[PDB]
Amino acid sequence: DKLPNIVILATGGTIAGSALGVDTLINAVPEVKKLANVKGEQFSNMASENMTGDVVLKLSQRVNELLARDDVDGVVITHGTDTVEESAYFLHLTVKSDKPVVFVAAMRPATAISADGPMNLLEAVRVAGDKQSRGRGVMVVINDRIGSARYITKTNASTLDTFRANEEGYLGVIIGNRIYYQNRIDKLHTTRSVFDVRGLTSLPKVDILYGYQDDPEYLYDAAIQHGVKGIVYAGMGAGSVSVRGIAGMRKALEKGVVVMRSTRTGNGIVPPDEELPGLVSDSLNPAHARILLMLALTRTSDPKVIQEYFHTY
Amino acid sequence: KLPNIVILATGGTIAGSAATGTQTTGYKAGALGVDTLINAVPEVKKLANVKGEQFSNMASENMTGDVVLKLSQRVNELLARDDVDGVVITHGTDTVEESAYFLHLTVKSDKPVVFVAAMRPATAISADGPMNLLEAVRVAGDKQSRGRGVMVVINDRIGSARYITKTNASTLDTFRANEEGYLGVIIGNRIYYQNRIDKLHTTRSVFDVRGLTSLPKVDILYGYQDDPEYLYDAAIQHGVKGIVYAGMGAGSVSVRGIAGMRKALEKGVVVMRSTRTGNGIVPPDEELPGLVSDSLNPAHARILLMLALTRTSDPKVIQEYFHTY
Amino acid sequence: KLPNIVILATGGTIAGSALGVDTLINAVPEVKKLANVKGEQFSNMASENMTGDVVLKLSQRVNELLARDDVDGVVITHGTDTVEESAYFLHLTVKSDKPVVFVAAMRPATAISADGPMNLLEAVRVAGDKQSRGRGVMVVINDRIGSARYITKTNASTLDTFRANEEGYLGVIIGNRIYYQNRIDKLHTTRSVFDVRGLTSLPKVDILYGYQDDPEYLYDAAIQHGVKGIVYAGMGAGSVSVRGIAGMRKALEKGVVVMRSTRTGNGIVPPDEELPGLVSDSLNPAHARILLMLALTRTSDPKVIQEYFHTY
Amino acid sequence: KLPNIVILATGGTIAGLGVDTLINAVPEVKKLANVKGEQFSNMASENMTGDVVLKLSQRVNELLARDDVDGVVITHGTDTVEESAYFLHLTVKSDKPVVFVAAMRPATAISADGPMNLLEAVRVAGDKQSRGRGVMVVINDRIGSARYITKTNASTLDTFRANEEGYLGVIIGNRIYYQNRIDKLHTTRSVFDVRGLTSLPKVDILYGYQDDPEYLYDAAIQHGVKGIVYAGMGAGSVSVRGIAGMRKALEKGVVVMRSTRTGNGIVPPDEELPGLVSDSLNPAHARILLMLALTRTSDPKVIQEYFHTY
């Protein structure tokens, strides 16, 4: 081991060029050879909008397996952009290793002009292989930037630069074939996390309900009746709740559903409010809130413990 | 001369101190709220001849389409009058973008309509509301403000109602339009106009609602991993005319979402694919069901879809409204 | 009929490899479906070495091209470092409503995931579109359409460097389609008064930085070398130290125009009658300088120049 | 009981001796801390100087050694707080909270920010999770690291930002939410001690633009500058005129530091270009470090390593 050993797990199609697909990827971008000893694995093949808790769970298990081996220094997972933040945050909380776990994606198809995936892959591999990258949590790498799974989110439908943490910034950047680490997230993750799900084959059902003018109560009932253990509320402003939403939350709590108030806004803190039902999501966005609420619910259903989870994770 | 500005209030005051030390409150017994407001910021009197009017009294999270409808119609009456040069509207920050965009589409006047709000309680140390109102009144009263569409004014910034959004739950600077910027900024008691929106609005808008008392039900459904079909069902069952998909990425749809959407379409519901991301273009994609939302975020998409649905059920017409408004 | 678009190259190509402009056109052959393009190698330098004299000629050429009825628009390949300067110059001096689209690339043409190919394609689409007319000069990169008056390189090294934080993008290009969002509320192009077609050189204008312990000797240097104007990349909102105030006042005595701008990157420098010189409005140093050069060709009267800075 | 926080003032009040006016104007601070006002100086940040910042550093170190000071809040003008704050970032030998604070609106102005800015700043200094995080600038509900934070906008409340690096934390609902820890050396881990020094090396900043003059480099040389920070075009790019000027300076043993006028991001190494590169330090920050750098060494390599690690 002189060049590091990197396993590129593919969860979908290639993001570079045009076998399994993970072989097309590595063929298309031969320069990763010079960065690391790479071995492909086509873990799954789906588009990220179809990625599912059950599979992310299998991916968390696979990645833990890989990072236990001594002949693997880090893992690069190719993933679609749409839910990479959800997958990433899941493995952020559940991977019991300091070894680097780098999600990578592309905002343009590999056949498109000026495709971003090739250089995205190169940056991702370089981040996984470099030994300064240990203990930073799960990372998302794209467009010269390194996001923390817990903070990074896809902020823009269709642009290369979509991945941003406006308030938290990037862990680091890759410019001129070199890595600049700027931040260490000040949250628990990976080896310091309490969430181990190597036992499980299934996760609690958690659904996200939006906040808006005239938001209907009936979507709360529906969700209760299909037996969710958690509702995340992508709420108006700072998790503000209409009379209708309060009513729906009253009825969820009575059935022992955990209600987690987040924000549709895009950024920032949802502060405690005891005049308002349910928990609050700190600075976790809806998609991240659900991921943590699910994992919370596999270990407890005590409001106070889960709340503290949201403040520390 | 000073212009004539009505200040419609929709909730509690955004300006006014309480009592600590030896000072006494600006919250008098039985005081209306918009009077509390105007008495708390007598510097507005220098900018305009203002007249308070308590239109409603709720937190913006409880603002309802049906109330917004009356607000639009109330504003139209005012702006038709000669004795009214512009209108400022105090509103909670949470859904001001929703209310603002409604009137952006439905006010048949070039006269400035400025929403104003506050992220800090009036009684807070360093409350933003005072200066927010001053700016808001200045923008409504200036002649250069005519024909710009409905504006949202807060933290020294003038946001178009079509683009502006609350991007942070808690901060003073929450209202941004990352890709579209601000129409203008207020700095040193001077207005600096930077942009005119290149979309239809107000007096060039077809969404007349002057004789309406009701609006089509539109609901919004989130896109996420393991997103349930049954939520589409639930919306359909409750008779929604439209569904706005707060979509994954560029309105990407899971197998479950596609199932739910093609069900909604069969029963005559218009599906509108937007994004949860917070920004950017959801492009056309004839591989996927429903229409797409251009750069309209879910909250805005709902408003335009509601108003389009008052005029048509024709997807091709609705889509074009979403590219032009 | 496709639109006819002349492509002026000011430097090396930004797409493909082997005139650089032919290498460019060939390397992205999809542009031929969008417009009929002729290439033309105006110059060949890195944007860093782009000079006022050369930019004047670029403006004059673009006016020649757009005077012709057989040209619907122009695309100008330019380096990222000073495109905002070149572009703002033409923004003010091109007497046409026809599209003028600066384009650039943050990665070399031969890099992995080079942005240049797609930037160019978008640039031509914008240049070729009829909704694009009368919007002023544009900078098109990373799916964005930036107004030359607002857009700036906000980052040393990133693809997404060109932003206008406060005033946003004129529009965006997503899925082979232009989405127009804003028209700049400022005078430009055919409503500009700046017509430099009779000129062969431009007044000398320098930019001095504001910072703790900033020296007056830099003002002296500027004055002694005959600058007609000085732009001040001021601390905050054009704030001036005692040393700055001395050097400005000395400059003003000598009849140099002083324009107080900001090093912050964004925002309004407002009027302050207690401080010397003029204020840049929301013009960043680099834009401020362009407009001061041109203003100096017509007037040396501070009142008139102040109005320019508020309306251009 | 409460922690003991000294408020040093470098100018007039930002709420309501300025520093007594300030504390009387914000009596809610005394429920957060035990506050001793102290009027260090009285100037607009525009006039703050290296020799004064050097004294402010020394003074702050004095206070932080005392057992009856848990941390220090420093009122300062917005225009150059980033320079002052980053100087102390590097030269304060203590883990105790050093929080700069400021206001974009004057104290008399409607909806002034100084009161809540100060309150927040005191809360950040009084909190015990605030230790060991570097010098901090607190304003508009945000805690920014001196090394990254900058005044991005001439005239706005929200001007203080670090687009790429983000905020160390935020204060929302009277509670501090720490987000990141800066992954750079600072305070107690810094090598820069200036408690001995009386004055500082001369470092000036020249802008990069079209038609930039060589003669300003000449002038800088002839007025005896020890370093020149280049606020360069794009990524430290240099015109032919800038190169010649930079070469002359390097001949004379002046350390040339290539930064960016762009306002954010990395200037990368480039052995074909003269001088050092500023990493992600903007011109204002780069000058500060180059100053302190030149008090220990004038070896390019060592200084370059400073720039990558501080």
Among A290, A296, A211, A293, smallest CA distance to A245 is for A211
Among C129, C130, C149, smallest CA distance to C138 is for C149
- Asked if residue C82 lies in contact with residue D210, where contact means CB atoms within 8 angstroms, the answer is yes
Kindly compute the dihedral angle of the four CA atoms of residues C16, C19, C21, C25, in this order, to the nearest 10 degrees: -60
**CA B231 to CA D137: how far, in whole Å?**
46
Minimal CA separation from C69 to chain D, in Å:
32
Give CA B238 to chain center in angstroms. Answer: 25
Chain B positions in Cβ-Cβ contact with residue D119 (cut-off 8 Å): 125
Chain B positions in Cβ-Cβ contact with residue A263 (cut-off 8 Å): 169
C267 → closest Cβ in D49, D154, D234: D154
Last residue of a domain, one of A145, A165, A192: A192
Residues D168 and D278 in one domain: no
Judge whether C197 lies within some domain.
no
For C51, the token pair is 């000079």
- Asked if residue C139 lies in contact with residue C129, where contact means CB atoms within 8 angstroms, the answer is no
Residues B171 and B249 in one domain: no
Residues 6+ away with beta carbon under 8 Å from D222? none
**CA D84 to CA D56: how far, in whole Å?**
9
| Closest-CA residue of chain C to A145 | C158
Neighbours of chain D (3+ CB pairs under 8 A): A, B, C
**CA D116 to CA B126: how far, in whole Å?**
6
Cβ–Cβ gap A158/C174 under 8 Å: yes
Strand pairing category for A5-10 and A37-42 = parallel
For D45, list phi and psi in degrees, rounded to 5: -50, -30
Residues D171 and D93 in one domain: yes
Cβ–Cβ gap B222/A243 under 8 Å: no
| Closest-CA residue of chain C to A16 | C113
Q: Does the annotation place B60 within a ligand binding site?
A: yes
Domain range spanning residue C19? 4-191
- Asked if residue A72 lies in contact with residue A66, where contact means CB atoms within 8 angstroms, the answer is yes
**CA C276 to CA C254: how far, in whole Å?**
13
A170 → closest Cβ in D164, D169, D184: D164
Q: Count CB atoms within 10 A of the CB of residue C111.
A: 13
Cβ–Cβ gap D182/A178 under 8 Å: no
Cβ–Cβ gap B225/A52 under 8 Å: yes
**CA B207 to CA B185: how far, in whole Å?**
29
Kindly compute the dihedral angle of the four CA atoms of residues D76, D81, D87, D90, in this order, to the nearest 10 degrees: 100
Residues 6+ away with beta carbon under 8 Å from A181? A132, A133, A136, A146, A171, A172, D183
Among A307, A299, A249, A305, smallest CA distance to A94 is for A299
| Closest-CA residue of chain B to D27 | B21
- CA pseudo-torsion sign A52, A58, A63, A64: positive
Judge whether D249 lies within some domain.
yes
Q: Which helix (H) or strand (E) holds C310?
A: helix C302-311
**What residue type is C48 in one-letter code?**
E
Residues 6+ away with beta carbon under 8 Å from D57? D87, D88, D91, D92, D194, D195
CA distances from A283 to A28, A272, C190, D169 (A): 39, 12, 49, 11
**CA B156 to CA B94: how far, in whole Å?**
18
Q: Count CB atoms within 10 A of the CB of residue D226.
A: 18
Residues 6+ away with beta carbon under 8 Å from A152? A85, A88, A140, A163, A164, A165, A170
Cβ–Cβ gap A175/C158 under 8 Å: yes
**CA A49 to CA D183: how far, in whole Å?**
34
- The contact set of C with B (CB < 8 A) is 150, 164-169, 171-172, 174-175, 177, 179-186, 267-268, 270-271, 281-282
Instruction: Give me the half-sphere count of Cα atoms (radius 13 Å) on the Cβ side of residue D8.
Output: 27
Cβ–Cβ gap C114/A112 under 8 Å: no
Q: Which residues pair with A154 in a beta bridge?
A: A163
**CA C224 to CA C218: how far, in whole Å?**
10
3-class secondary-structure state, position A90 = helix
**What residue type is B28 in one-letter code?**
K
DSSP code of residue A188: -
Cβ–Cβ gap B249/A213 under 8 Å: no
C217 → closest Cβ in D46, D223, D263: D223
- Asked if residue A277 lies in contact with residue A305, where contact means CB atoms within 8 angstroms, the answer is no
Q: Which helix (H) or strand (E) holds A220?
A: helix A218-225
For A96, the token pair is 């019991």
For C213, list phi and psi in degrees, rounded to 5: 70, 25
Give CA C166 to chain center in angstroms. Answer: 17
Judge whether A200 lies within some domain.
no
- Asked if residue D171 lies in contact with residue D118, where contact means CB atoms within 8 angstroms, the answer is no
Last residue of a domain, one of B171, B204, B237: B204
Give CA B106 to chain center in angstroms. Answer: 12
For D34, the token pair is 């035990």
Q: Count CB atoms within 10 A of the CB of residue B315.
A: 14
Last residue of a domain, one of A128, A157, A192: A192
The CATH number of the domain holding residue C116 is 3.40.50.1170
For C49, list phi and psi in degrees, rounded to 5: -95, 10
Picking from A114, A156, A158, A161 by the largest number of C CB atoms within 10 A of its own CB, the best residue to mutate is A114
**What residue type is B111 in one-letter code?**
K
**CA B131 to CA D112: how far, in whole Å?**
9
Longest dimension (CA), chain C: 63
Residues C168 and C276 in one domain: no
Residue-by-residue DSSP string for chain D:
---EEEEEESSS-S---HHHHHHHH-TTGGGT-EEEEEE-----GGG--HHHHHHHHHHHHHHHHSTT-SEEEEE--HHHHHHHHHHHHHH---SS-EEEE--SS-TTSTT-SHHHHHHHHHHHHH-STTTTS--EEEETTEEEETTT-EE-BSS-TT-EE-TTT--SEEEETTEEEE-EEE-S--GGG-----SS-SS---EEEEE--TT--SHHHHHHHHTT-SEEEEEEBTTTB--HHHHHHHHHHHHTTPEEEEEESSSSS-B---TTSSSEE-BT--HHHHHHHHHHHTTT---HHHHHHHHHH-
Residue-by-residue DSSP string for B128-188:
SHHHHHHHHHHHHH-GGGTTS-SEEEETTEEEETTT-EE-BSS-TT-EE-TTT--SEEEET
Strand pairing category for B190-193 and C73-77 = unpaired
Residues D184 and D214 in one domain: no
Picking from B178, B193, B198 by the largest number of C CB atoms within 10 A of its own CB, the best residue to mutate is B198
Residues A166 and A231 in one domain: no
**Tokens 């000058």 belong to which residue?**
D287
Q: Which stretches does DSSP call E strand in chain C? A: 4-9, 36-41, 73-77, 100-103, 138-141, 144-147, 152-153, 162-163, 171-173, 178-180, 182-184, 205-209, 229-234, 257-262, 278-279
Cβ–Cβ gap B94/A239 under 8 Å: no
Q: Count CB atoms within 10 A of the CB of residue B33.
A: 19
Residues 6+ away with beta carbon under 8 Å from D66? none
Helices A218-225 and A243-254 meet at what angle, rounded to 10? 20
**Tokens 């590595």 belong to which residue?**
A26
**CA C35 to CA C16: how far, in whole Å?**
19
Neighbours of chain C (3+ CB pairs under 8 A): A, B, D
Judge whether D14 lies within some domain.
yes
For B199, list phi and psi in degrees, rounded to 5: -140, 165
Among A221, A192, A193, A197, smallest CA distance to A209 is for A221
Q: What is the resolution of this structure in A?
A: 2.8
Residue-by-residue DSSP string for A270-284:
B---TTSSSEE-BT-
CB pairs under 8 A between A and C: 54
- The contact set of A with C (CB < 8 A) is 29, 31, 108, 112-120, 122, 143-144, 157-161, 173, 175-176
Residues 6+ away with beta carbon under 8 Å from C209? C233, C263, D205, D206, D207, D231, D283
Picking from C28, C33, C112, C177 by the largest number of A CB atoms within 10 A of its own CB, the best residue to mutate is C112
Residues A127 and A266 in one domain: no
Residues C105 and C218 in one domain: no
**CA B155 to CA B175: how far, in whole Å?**
8
- The contact set of C with A (CB < 8 A) is 28, 30, 111-119, 121, 142-143, 156-160, 172, 174-175
Q: Count CB atoms within 10 A of the CB of residue A201.
A: 9
Chain B positions in Cβ-Cβ contact with residue C169 (cut-off 8 Å): 179-181
Among D267, D255, D252, smallest CA distance to D299 is for D255
Q: Which of C10, C13, C93, C152 is catalytic?
A: C13
Strand pairing category for C162-163 and C152-153 = antiparallel
Give all strands of the β-sheet with B190-193 in edge-to-edge order.
B49-54, B4-9, B86-90, B113-116, B151-154, B157-160, B184-187, B190-193
For A280, list phi and psi in degrees, rounded to 5: -130, 155
Q: Count CB atoms within 10 A of the CB of residue B223.
A: 26
- The contact set of A with D (CB < 8 A) is 151, 165-170, 172-173, 175-176, 178, 180-186, 268-269, 271-272, 282-283
- Asked if residue A8 lies in contact with residue A78, where contact means CB atoms within 8 angstroms, the answer is yes
**What residue type is A237 in one-letter code?**
G
Instruction: Let me know if A275 is exposed, middle or buried by CB neighbors in 10 A (0-12, 13-18, 19+).
Output: exposed
- CA pseudo-torsion sign C50, C55, C57, C62: positive
Residue-by-residue DSSP string for B25-43:
-S--TT--SHHHHHHH-TT
Q: Which of B13, B36, B95, B202 is catalytic?
A: B13
Picking from D127, D141, D183 by the largest number of A CB atoms within 10 A of its own CB, the best residue to mutate is D183
Judge whether C196 lies within some domain.
no
Q: Which stretches does DSSP call E strand in C167-264? A: 171-173, 178-180, 182-184, 205-209, 229-234, 257-262
Picking from C56, C162, C212 by the largest number of D CB atoms within 10 A of its own CB, the best residue to mutate is C212
Residues 6+ away with beta carbon under 8 Å from D225? D202, D203, D204, D254
- Asked if residue B321 lies in contact with residue B292, where contact means CB atoms within 8 angstroms, the answer is no
Residues A137 and A165 in one domain: yes
Q: Which helix (H) or strand (E) holds A123?
A: helix A117-129
Cβ–Cβ gap A113/C160 under 8 Å: no
Judge whether C170 lies within some domain.
yes
A173 → closest Cβ in D170, D180, D266: D266
Q: Which helix (H) or strand (E) holds B219?
A: strand B218-222
3-class secondary-structure state, position C258 = strand
Residues 6+ away with beta carbon under 8 Å from C53? C200, C201, C202
For B255, the token pair is 């197998």
- Asked if residue B227 lies in contact with residue B256, where contact means CB atoms within 8 angstroms, the answer is yes
Neighbours of chain B (3+ CB pairs under 8 A): A, C, D
Give CA D304 to chain center in angstroms. Answer: 19
**CA B143 to CA B136: how far, in whole Å?**
14
Q: Return the ∠ at Cα A290 (arms to A286 and A295), rounded to 5°.
A: 150
Residues B159 and B37 in one domain: yes
Cβ–Cβ gap A31/C112 under 8 Å: yes
Residues B179 and B306 in one domain: no
Minimal CA separation from C166 to chain D, in Å:
9
The CATH number of the domain holding residue C247 is 3.40.50.40
Q: Which helix (H) or strand (E) holds A189?
A: none
Method in brief: X-ray
Q: Does the annotation place B17 within a ligand binding site?
A: no
Kindly compute the dihedral angle of the four CA atoms of residues D206, D208, D209, D214, in this order, to the nearest 10 degrees: 60
Strand pairing category for A172-174 and D160-161 = unpaired
**CA B67 to CA B215: how far, in whole Å?**
11
**CA B74 to CA D302: how far, in whole Å?**
70
**CA B190 to CA D150: how far, in whole Å?**
25
Counting the structural domains of chain D, the total is 2
Residues D39 and D166 in one domain: yes
Q: Which helix (H) or strand (E) holds C222?
A: helix C217-224
For C123, list phi and psi in degrees, rounded to 5: -55, -45
For B196, list phi and psi in degrees, rounded to 5: -105, 135
**CA A21 to CA D245: how far, in whole Å?**
53
C113 → closest Cβ in A118, A157, A159: A118
| Closest-CA residue of chain D to A310 | D177
Query: Binding site for substrate, residues of D?
Result: 45, 78-79
Judge whether D163 lies within some domain.
yes
Chain A positions in Cβ-Cβ contact with residue D179 (cut-off 8 Å): 151, 167-168, 185-186, 283
Cβ–Cβ gap A170/D165 under 8 Å: yes
Q: Which helix (H) or strand (E) holds B52?
A: strand B49-54
3-class secondary-structure state, position A150 = coil
**Tokens 């030994």 belong to which residue?**
A131
**CA A55 to CA A45: how far, in whole Å?**
11
- CA pseudo-torsion sign A121, A127, A129, A134: negative
Chain D positions in Cβ-Cβ contact with residue C215 (cut-off 8 Å): 204, 223
D268 → closest Cβ in A169, A176, A182: A176
**CA C120 to CA C140: how far, in whole Å?**
8
Minimal CA separation from A179 to chain C, in Å:
13
Q: Return the ∠ at Cα B285 (arms to B279 and B288), rounded to 5°.
A: 105
Chain B positions in Cβ-Cβ contact with residue D117 (cut-off 8 Å): 126
3-class secondary-structure state, position C233 = strand
- Asked if residue B304 lies in contact with residue B291, where contact means CB atoms within 8 angstroms, the answer is no
Helices C285-298 and C302-311 meet at what angle, rounded to 10? 130
**Tokens 């002023």 belong to which residue?**
C136
DSSP code of residue C112: T
Strand pairing category for D98-101 and D71-75 = parallel
**Tokens 């990352």 belong to which residue?**
B178
**CA C119 to CA C109: how far, in whole Å?**
11
- Asked if residue A5 lies in contact with residue A129, where contact means CB atoms within 8 angstroms, the answer is no
**CA D226 to CA D252: how far, in whole Å?**
9
Q: Count CB atoms within 10 A of the CB of residue C274.
A: 5
- Asked if residue C293 lies in contact with residue C206, where contact means CB atoms within 8 angstroms, the answer is no
Judge whether B209 lies within some domain.
no
